[PDB]
Design a protein around this nucleic acid. Structure first.
Lengths: 130, 167, 51, 117, 214, 106, 196
RNA sequence: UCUAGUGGGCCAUUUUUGGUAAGCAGAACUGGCGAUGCGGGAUGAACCGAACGUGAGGUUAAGGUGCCGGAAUGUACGCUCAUCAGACACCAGAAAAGGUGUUAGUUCGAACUAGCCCUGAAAAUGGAUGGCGCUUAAGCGUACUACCCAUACCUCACCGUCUGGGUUAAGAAGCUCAGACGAGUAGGCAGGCGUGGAGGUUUGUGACGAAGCCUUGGGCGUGAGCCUGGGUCGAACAGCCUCUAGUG
RNA sequence: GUACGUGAAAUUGCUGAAAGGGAAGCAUUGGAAAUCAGUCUUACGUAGGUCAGCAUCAGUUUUCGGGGGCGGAAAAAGAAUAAGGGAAGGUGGCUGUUUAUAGCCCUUGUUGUAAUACGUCCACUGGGGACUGAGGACUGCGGCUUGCCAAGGAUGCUGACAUAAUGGU
């Protein structure tokens, strides 16, 4: 929450989105369109990045179909160190390579994506535009 | 929000009156229904016509020909009070006959506690000559008119941080 | 039969069911459109602007 | 269809809280000046037929079954074809020997027992 | 199989063409009144428009403290409940009925939109003394088909134009059960419409009120 | 420490009520900076919550939350009507609520 | 518009009832309110009329144990709290909690003379009375009905005002320097397209 | 056709009689209260609005939106300053006549004429526009918007009642579909719950604990009630169909 | 244990818990604390507990926005531009006068099939929020192109927790 991210593609219901992992450390995730405030910031070129492989099956979790779960070893499992496929890491690095040059070219946007949105005293979101 | 209506009507023809006379009235009313009611009210007191034995032959809504021009209106009225023995002439300066009547109704209710039912408008005339003009209306007609802005109390904005300038 | 009442004004399928004419009805048609022949008699205007 | 209760609190008799001779069991107020009978605002409500529950979910336990009282094994076998409609409820006067026998009878039938433990 | 669909396909178009004819009649009548008024203005004479034959009455008062005569008349009008609406064929007999119950009801001249949306959104038929909604043309045909009223549009035409079978059409229509007006009434509801209230005759102003209740 | 607060501060004023009869099912909420019903239209459908603190640890948490949604504006001064999954306790009159920015449409 | 944790209100130039109505509503809203300079409050109407009103209030007392009857507080801050109390549901637990959230004081005591003091334009006399209308001051009304600390409140007030004036000159000297250094930075005119 | 209760009424609108007058006595017409909750008039049997099955949403009535109190310290134009102002119908009370008070009018400066204010106006526990308070109002007169909310209206779910339509493939005493409707004292009728005893019945329960009793356990029913876990206890008791009564 | 079967209530003492500023009791709604059942775990990719989020719809409703038809004095105005008339609350000029070194008022023509406002209508359309999901194979009335469909009442895609989490006392 509060992170600034770059929309890659619009999935069936949500948006496949990632703030460049080398900028703010937000990996490629689906985010429901009702939980985002779209900004009026200058657009980032996402035409050169492949978005066909980001599907519901790609982001799908492993099927469980049983009530047994939870363990300290279970939490020691998953994690970025384990679980996280090398292909997922490669895809994150590839989209980073295709996205960074645009935010490097347009000024102040790299660090804008690094920052975190927050409300301050006297701020009224209905009057404010993003 | 009153409106000026030209109401023309006549009683229905009979064997005694094959060709009845058409009578027209200019009267101010919020809508056409009240305008027809007041027309029958005035025609009933004068000239032996019910609503039943008469009919409204024409209804028209009159707008101000010059609504952007300041004018002086002299209004003669019949005022009915607790004593009810009164005629008045008042003058109101504004851009339309409808507004002058509205300002008359507010002023008459404020100063004499007279209601819409109690007041009947004898005639509304535009006074064109300055000499023909009420002292207050004349001294508004002063060519060199100038005066300071009167007090006007200037979202919720409670708990102001600074004392107001009010000047 | 008819377990739920559907408003034809809001349900275009129910409106299609009841009225097989809403398909071709053509609400907006330009009628007055050739000279706009202003029709007000001089005697009418004088009585209107009388008193 | 899940079970919905129009009302969950009991209809307690008026003034049963103040007098011990007056019990909680609901009695209709016949008094000429009774505030509760006249339905003054703030007084206790009275039982009405509008409070009745859905005919499909009436007499149903939260699990959807109806607790059918059971006193012997033959009473259990009456629920042979209605093990998804009724649940066996062993009576309080049944001894421990038949209580065990009814429990194994009901578990064989697949009939749930409300007071098995 | 296809014999039924073909025969009803024919029947449905008969409904369509009559609906087209009715709409053309509405447009022609509206144009004729406009042109006749324009001719009167141009020539300086006065054209008295046709007085309304159709009246819509809404019961604005509740069911308490009513004299027996007014209570009888409103029962004859089928205005049993507050905010109940009925279509009335206006004549001398009806005029003096509405005169008596004027403190308790309001009425005026309905327009085409008012009649159309009343019958579409609040349209219920009296089928075997039961309030059956008008969700199919079979319901209207099964009751008013002896008078060649086969469709909702036929019923609307009969009501709006006061046809020869207006009594049967009006009695077929259940008394409209209107909601409370969105936006409210005037400040005082039980004065006459002339003196700032909302009771009594209000002429064309019944249409805005009905659209508040629809 | 001013890098947070993705919500808007609001206060629970009272239940929805007549002069003498209260309706605890729906509440009256004053959102700060919301001064008219036109402004309340933006906050319609937002997710409002009451956050309070308890001694007992439910799932290892000292903080427990009652959620709700802004339903409609109330009056002319920007107050809104709010419906909660659990009716807010009457002791919260004057307490604070968090109005998130989601479900967002801006 | 926005609620602060504690709001300090300067009661100078304010009307008793209008300010009490605003304060009572804020207290019920869960906001902590401090009202200073209650002796500078105003009551619309000339002094003798308001003097008669308070003297009529003074008469209210039990025939048995006047020590049970209404207690008539002669201090301007206690007159203000009386108005707020009558505008609150103080017999109710909610109303009591609101009352302890109000601190009304004469003058500006040291916990509050170093804090910002807001005003309520809905209750300011200059905005709320027609010019030429007579009004009275609560402090004078208090002093001639029994309040006996009008002089000491005044004398302490000029000392506070003298110290406040010294503080202002020191702050204004700082603001003069920061303002002069403001336009020296070229960025001040660079960010002119942003409205700052 | 048979029968119950009733045969003390009361209030209001309007008309009206007796009366010095009366919260007085007497009638006429209607509406009410009695027998009736709810919204409102602070409070009240008849005033205003609206008449009531259990609920959800929406919208209104009367009345209100400074704070208590849900809702504009809204809009427009004036009037009023009151040395104990005024503030909403019923209603909880004041008149003639004046007042260098003031604001507007009428007719020949003079008189009148009106609206508000003051005077006339005057009691006994301390206290009442409901209170706080309110003065370009939060007072009064008029106009116009927005808003608040009743058990009323609208849509919907459910309960019951009544009514109508089906059902020889469905304890037909059953199943199914639809619509309208729902206040109630005195009183009438109907279907149910509970108690003691009798006939039949259930391969009925019981000293491995019947009946009874206690219970911050659970469950069912709109309800009368019913079942159950645990504790105590020690000899009998129950379901169903009918019979009966010293039956709540 | 004879003050003797069972041993109720009133009422009483002890213990634990809780509450309390001139009564108490009650009703409604939720909090807190204690207490507790159901459900689940399975059964056969399939279906399945509790609670949420979103999408696509249906019913009901509220709140904003755009486009168009039509009506009136076929708005009144006004702007721009040609005649004539009058003047001031008299401008330049010289208290008095008639557009000049400011202008205004009235009438007519024109631009014009002017625009807007208001009224009314669209079986024209774009949003946002709220409540509800009754029914349970098939039939019916319709639209589309036989399949499809928003058309005789909610399904789809998921996640968290499987918990005192929901729910009850």
């Amino acid at each position: 929450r509060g992170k600034r991210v770059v929309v890659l593609s619009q999935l069936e219901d949500t948006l496949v989105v990632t703030g460049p992992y080398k900028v703010n450390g937000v990996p490629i995730r689906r985010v429901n369109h009702r939980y985002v405030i779209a900004t009026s910031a200058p657009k980032i070129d996402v035409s050169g990045v492949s978005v066909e492989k980001f599907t519901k099956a790609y982001f799908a979790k492993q099927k469980r179909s049983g009530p047994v779960k939870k363990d300290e070893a279970f939490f020691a499992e998953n994690a970025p160190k384990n679980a996280l496929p090398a292909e997922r890491i490669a895809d994150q690095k590839a989209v980073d390579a295709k996205l960074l040059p645009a935010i490097k070219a347009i000024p102040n946007m790299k660090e804008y994506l690094a920052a975190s949105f927050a409300l301050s005293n006297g701020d009224r979101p209905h009057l404010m535009k993003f | 929000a009153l409106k000026e209506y030209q109401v023309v009507g006549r009683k229905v023809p009979t064997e005694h009156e094959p060709v009845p006379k058409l009578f027209r009235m200019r009267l101010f009313a919020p809508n056409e229904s009240v305008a027809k009611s007041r027309y029958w009210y005035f025609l009933k007191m004068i000239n032996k016509v019910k609503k039943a034995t008469g009919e409204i032959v024409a209804i028209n809504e009159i707008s101000e020909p010059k609504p952007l021009k300041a004018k002086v209106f002299g209004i003669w009225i019949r005022y009915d009070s607790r004593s009810g023995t009164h005629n008045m002439y008042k003058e109101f300066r504004d851009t339309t006959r409808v507004g002058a009547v509205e300002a008359m109704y507010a002023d008459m209710a404020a100063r004499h506690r007279a209601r819409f039912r109690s007041i009947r408008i004898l005639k509304v005339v535009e006074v064109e000559k300055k000499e023909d003009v009420r002292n207050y209306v004349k001294q508004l007609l002063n060519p060199h008119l100038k005066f300071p802005l009167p007090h006007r109390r200037t979202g919720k904005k409670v708990f102001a941080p600074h004392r107001p300038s009010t000047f | 039969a008819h377990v739920q009442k559907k408003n034809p004004l809001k349900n275009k399928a129910v409106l299609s069911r009841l009225n097989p004419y809403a398909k071709a009805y053509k609400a907006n048609v330009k009628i007055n459109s050739e000279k706009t022949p202003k029709a007000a008699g001089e005697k009418f205007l004088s009585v209107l602007h009388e008193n | 269809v899940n079970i919905i209760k129009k009302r969950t609190k009991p209809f307690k008799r008026h003034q049963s809280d103040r007098f011990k001779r007056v019990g909680e069991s609901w009695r209709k107020p016949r008094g000429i000046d009774s505030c509760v009978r006249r339905r003054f605002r703030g007084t206790i409500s009275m039982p009405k037929i509008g409070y009745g529950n859905n005919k499909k979910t009436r007499y149903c336990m939260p699990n959807g079954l109806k607790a059918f009282l059971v006193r012997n094994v033959s009473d259990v076998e009456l629920l042979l074809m209605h093990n998804k409609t009724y649940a066996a409820e062993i009576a309080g006067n049944v001894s421990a020997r038949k209580r065990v026998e009814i429990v194994e009878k009901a578990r064989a039938l697949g009939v749930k027992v409300t007071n098995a433990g | 199989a296809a014999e039924k669909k073909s025969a009803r396909q024919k029947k449905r178009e008969l409904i369509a063409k009559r609906a087209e004819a009715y709409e053309a009649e509405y447009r022609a009548a509206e144009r004729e009144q406009i042109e006749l008024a324009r001719k009167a203005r141009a020539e300086g004479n006065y054209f008295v428009p046709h007085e309304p034959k159709l009246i819509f009455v809404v019961r604005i008062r509740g069911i308490n403290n009513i004299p027996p005569k007014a209570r009888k008349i409103m029962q004859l009008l089928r205005l049993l409940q507050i905010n109940n609406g009925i279509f009335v064929k206006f004549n001398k007999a009806i005029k003096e009925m509405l005169q008596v119950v004027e403190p308790y009801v309001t009425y005026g001249i309905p327009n085409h939109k008012t009649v159309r949306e009343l019958i579409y959104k609040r349209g219920f038929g009296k089928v075997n003394k039961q309030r059956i909604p008008l969700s199919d043309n079979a319901i209207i045909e099964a009751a008013l088909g002896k008078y060649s009223i086969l469709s909702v549009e036929d019923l609307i035409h009969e009501i709006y134009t006061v046809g020869p079978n207006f009594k049967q059409a009006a009695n077929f229509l259940w008394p409209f059960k209107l909601s409370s007006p969105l936006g409210g009434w005037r400040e005082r509801k039980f004065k006459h419409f002339i003196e700032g209230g909302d009771a009594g005759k209000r002429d064309e102003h019944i249409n805005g009120l009905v659209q508040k209740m629809l | 420490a001013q890098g947070h607060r993705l919500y808007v501060k609001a206060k629970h004023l009272s239940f929805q009520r007549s002069k003498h009869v209260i309706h605890p099912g729906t509440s009256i909420v004053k959102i700060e900076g919301c001064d008219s019903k036109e402004e309340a239209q933006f906050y319609l459908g937002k997710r409002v919550c009451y956050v309070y603190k308890s001694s007992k640890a439910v799932r290892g948490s000292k903080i427990r939350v009652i959620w709700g949604t802004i339903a409609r504006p109330h009056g002319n001064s920007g107050a809104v009507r709010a419906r909660f999954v659990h009716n807010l306790p009457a002791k919260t009159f004057g307490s604070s609520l968090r109005v998130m920015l989601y479900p967002s449409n801006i | 518009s926005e609620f602060q944790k504690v709001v300090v209100i300067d009661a100078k130039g304010h009307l008793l009832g209008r300010l009490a109505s605003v304060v009572a509503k804020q207290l019920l809203g869960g906001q902590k309110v401090v009202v200073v300079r209650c002796e500078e409050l105003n009551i619309s109407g000339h002094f003798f009329r308001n003097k008669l009103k308070y003297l009529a209030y003074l008469r209210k007392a039990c025939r048995y144990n006047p020590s049970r009857g209404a207690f008539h507080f002669r201090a301007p801050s206690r007159i203000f709290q009386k108005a707020v109390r009558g505008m609150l549901p103080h017999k109710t637990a909610r109303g009591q909690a609101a009352l302890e959230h109000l601190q009304a004081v004469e003058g500006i005591p040291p916990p509050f003379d170093k804090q910002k003091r807001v005003v309520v334009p809905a209750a300011l006399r200059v905005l709320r009375l027609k010019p030429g209308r007579k009004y009275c001051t609560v402090g004078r009304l208090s002093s001639e009905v029994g309040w006996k600390y009008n002089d000491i409140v005044a004398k302490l007030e000029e000392r506070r005002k003298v110290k406040s004036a010294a503080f202002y000159q020191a702050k204004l000297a700082k603001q003069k320097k920061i303002a002069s250094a403001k336009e020296a930075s070229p960025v001040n005119q660079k960010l002119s397209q942003f409205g700052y």
